Structure formats: C-alpha cells, structure tokens
C-alpha cells in the first residue's frame, strides 16, 4: 500500500478488485470462455469414438512418429487428437470403438513433441488398455 490512511478501506478494496483481473489466472478461472471452450467443461474424463489413426511427427532435437487417434465426442461433437502412449498398443485400438479419454497434466498446454495434443486414452470397450498391454485380460470377441 501507499495510502496508509485510517479511512481508505473502500479506496483500497476497490483498487484490489480492479487489479485481480489483470492476473491472468484469476481471469482464467472466473470468465466462462475458457470453461465453455474446453470440451471437457471442467471434467477429468470424456468418452468418445475413434474415427481415424494418425501418425503425427515430433518436434526438433527429438525425432519420432507419435501415434495419435482422432476421436469425436458424443455430447458436443468436437474433435480431438487423443494420443495412445506405449509400445504396441495401437493394434488393439480398433476403429469405431468407444474409448474414455483423459487429460495430460497440463491444463491447456501442449506437451513436447506431439504438437497440440492434451489428451490420452484410458479404456477401450470397457477394457483397460493397461490390462491389454500387460496381458492380464483379453479383448472380448
């Protein structure tokens, strides 16, 4: 503070109330455009259909072909590049199957090589992708 007056409570509080908005994160929390724009709409997971398999190329120093997958959500209809992680797990993901998608730990921010891919697959057809990779369970056919 600078006005250390005994009766400037109002003037102070007002000033604070104006400047909280210049903080980028508060504005992020309280204006709705971010929450609405986010397809997750303040959610951890979201279900969606696989419609095509895509090999997105990595950024520099690194060099790799990341295996992503174009899902279309049911509730909104928005389109997402959900990335499948680990080794040999893509042969499992068949086309036209429901997968539960989650975030990527960054709250609206791209991560490393995969440019603009904030989402990863957890399940396939009520079957944990982990269980398929480990070999505990099998795909129902």
């Amino acid at each position: 503070g600078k006005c250390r007056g005994l009766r400037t409570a109002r003037k102070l509080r007002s000033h604070r109330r104006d400047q909280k908005w210049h903080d980028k994160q508060y504005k992020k929390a309280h204006l709705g455009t971010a929450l609405k724009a986010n397809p997750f709409g303040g959610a951890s997971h979201a279900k969606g259909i696989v419609l095509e398999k895509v090999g997105v190329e990595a950024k520099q120093p690194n060099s790799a072909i990341r295996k992503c997958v174009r899902v279309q959500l049911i509730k909104n209809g928005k389109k997402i590049t959900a990335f499948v992680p680990n080794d040999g797990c893509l042969n499992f993901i068949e086309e036209n199957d429901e997968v539960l998608v989650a975030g990527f730990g960054r709250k609206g921010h791209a991560v490393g090589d995969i440019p603009g891919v904030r989402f990863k697959v957890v399940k396939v057809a009520n079957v944990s992708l982990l269980a398929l990779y480990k070999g505990k369970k099998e795909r129902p056919r």
């Binding site: 259909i49 419609l51 279309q72 959500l73 049911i74 036209n96 429901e98």
Partner: protein
C-alpha cells in the same frame, strides 16, 4: 451392421459384399412371465414391460455405440432385428437417434433368435441389397435350386 435381439440373447454382426462377420453377442437374465403368482401376477405385465424396456435400453445403447459415430452413422446400413416386436421398440424408442431415424434402412423379424435368423433377416433384406453380388448370388442360386 446387424442387431439381433431375443428373449434368449442378443447378437451383432456386419455384412460386406460377399463376407459376413460377427462383431459381438451377449446375454441378459431377464426373469420370465411366471415370476411370482397371486400377489405380483396382476402387476407383473407392467413391471415386466419396464424390465423389457430396460433390456431395450441396453440394446439401444449397443446400437448407438456401434451404428452412431459422433451422432452420425459411419457404417452405411443398419438392419435391426428381433422377434415379438423387439425391433419396433428399438426403432421407435427415443434413445434411438433421430439422425438415425432418417437412415433407418430396415427392421427384420426372426424366430428362435440368432445367427440363422440373422441369415433369414438377410434373406428378407435381399431386395434392399440389390447392388450386392451376394444378393445377386442368393437370387441366382435360388433359381438354380429351383
């Protein structure tokens, strides 16, 4: 695609030009009509129709899962199938999607409920899959057996 319903159990299967495929099948323990007499029998048909509709909800959910793709069908045709008016509840149900009602290709009755009935419902389809060589074969070999 093909959905096959029965009080016994369901079955889902696809159909290429020549090849016939099977996607999924399942069971549900829907308890039967006798259930419990005297006390329940009068209010049995009402509770049972609710439970049958719940089975219908599960079948409906499978058709959305399969035949819908972002509220838009990816597979071209969808042949619903069942006996005792199972398919009609699936057709007219509100869970069944409207963009899909636009493209309801056909509903088909069967007996016993299953793969042979799935095949028969294809035979009722026949005229619907006129472009397919499988249908032209079905018709030609039908005359050859005649």
């Amino acid at each position: 695609g093909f959905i096959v319903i029965d009080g016994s159990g369901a079955l889902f299967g696809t159909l290429q030009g020549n090849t016939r495929e099977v996607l999924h099948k399942f069971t549900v323990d829907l308890p039967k009509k006798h259930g419990r007499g005297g006390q329940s029998a009068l209010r049995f048909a009402r509770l049972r129709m609710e439970k049958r509709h719940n089975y219908v909800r599960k079948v409906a959910e499978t058709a959305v899962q399969l035949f819908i793709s972002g509220d838009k069908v990816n597979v071209a045709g969808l042949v619903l199938a069942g006996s005792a008016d199972f398919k009609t509840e699936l057709s007219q149900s509100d869970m069944f999607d409207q963009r899909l009602q636009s493209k309801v290709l056909k509903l088909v009755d069967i007996s016993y409920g299953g793969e042979n009935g799935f095949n028969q419902a294809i035979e009722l389809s026949t005229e619907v899959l006129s472009n397919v060589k499988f249908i032209q074969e079905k018709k030609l070999i039908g005359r050859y057996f005649d």
